[PDB]
């Protein structure tokens, strides 16, 4: 058998909430051909009184805790809203970041595997 709904847009129990959780962490495991973790660099970043010069260059600096910290609160609504998120903390990252660096390179494979995650 099977069932569906709709109509979420307020602070609810679904069984949605589940999934939200297992791409977020997917990801966070996720690490490199080696063992090097991906959204270790992206994970805290440095406040203006350490780098600044980061705000001036990035207007909309986008952290993992973003989302969680939302996330976890049942804040999200669907994998969808969440996936829009994660695009530019990688867009911006493409230049913020030179085109030959680790995180470069690294940010693109984040990209492509949560793109995977999505289920139809």
């Known amino acids: 058998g099977s069932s569906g709904s709709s109509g ?27 063992g090097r ?18 705000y001036l260059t990035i207007k909309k600096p986008m952290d993992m805790e973003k989302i969680r910290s939302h996330m976890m609160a049942n ?8 996936v829009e998120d ?3 903390m990688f867009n911006n990252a493409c230049t913020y970041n030179e085109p030959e660096s680790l995180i470069y390179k690294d940010a693109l494979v984040l990209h492509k595997v949560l793109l995977e995650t999505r289920r139809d």
């Open 75 to 82: 804040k999200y609504q669907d994998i969808d809203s969440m």
């Open 86 to 88: 994660f695009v530019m």
């Open 8 to 34: 979420k847009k307020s602070k609810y129990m679904t069984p949605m909430q589940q999934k939200l959780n297992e791409v977020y962490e997917a990801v966070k495991n996720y690490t490199d051909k080696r």
């Open 37 to 54: 973790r991906l959204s270790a660099i992206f994970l805290r970043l440095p406040s203006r009184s350490e780098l600044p010069d980061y």
